[PDB]
């Protein structure tokens, strides 16, 4: 769980200007994390929603 989260957090911070992984990138992250494409996409939707949310 921690490893998977760190994989996607590292990718996110390396792509803050365009935090939208392509279909191929989603497949790479799913392989590295052990998550499905659906789960990977959900994690990034939530990440982008929480970044812009107010305090």
Q: What is the CATH number of the domain that holds 5?
A: 1.10.10.60
- What is the structure's resolution, reported in angstroms to one decimal? 2.5
| Angstrom distance (rounded) from CA 39 to CA 32 | 13
| Angstrom distance (rounded) from CA 52 to CA 25 | 23
Containing structural domain, residue 36: 1-54
Instruction: Specify the number of domains making up the chain.
Output: 1
Give the chain's length: 55
Q: How was this structure determined?
A: X-ray
**Residue 14 · residue 21 · CB < 8 Å:** no
**Residue 55 is encoded by which pair of tokens?**
């305090």
């Amino acid at each position: 769980p921690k490893v998977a989260t760190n994989i996607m957090r590292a990718w996110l911070f390396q792509h803050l200007t365009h935090p939208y992984p392509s279909e191929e990138q989603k497949k790479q992250l799913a392989q590295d994390t052990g998550l499905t494409i659906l789960q990977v996409n959900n994690w990034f939707i939530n990440a982008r929603r929480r970044i812009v949310q107010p305090m």
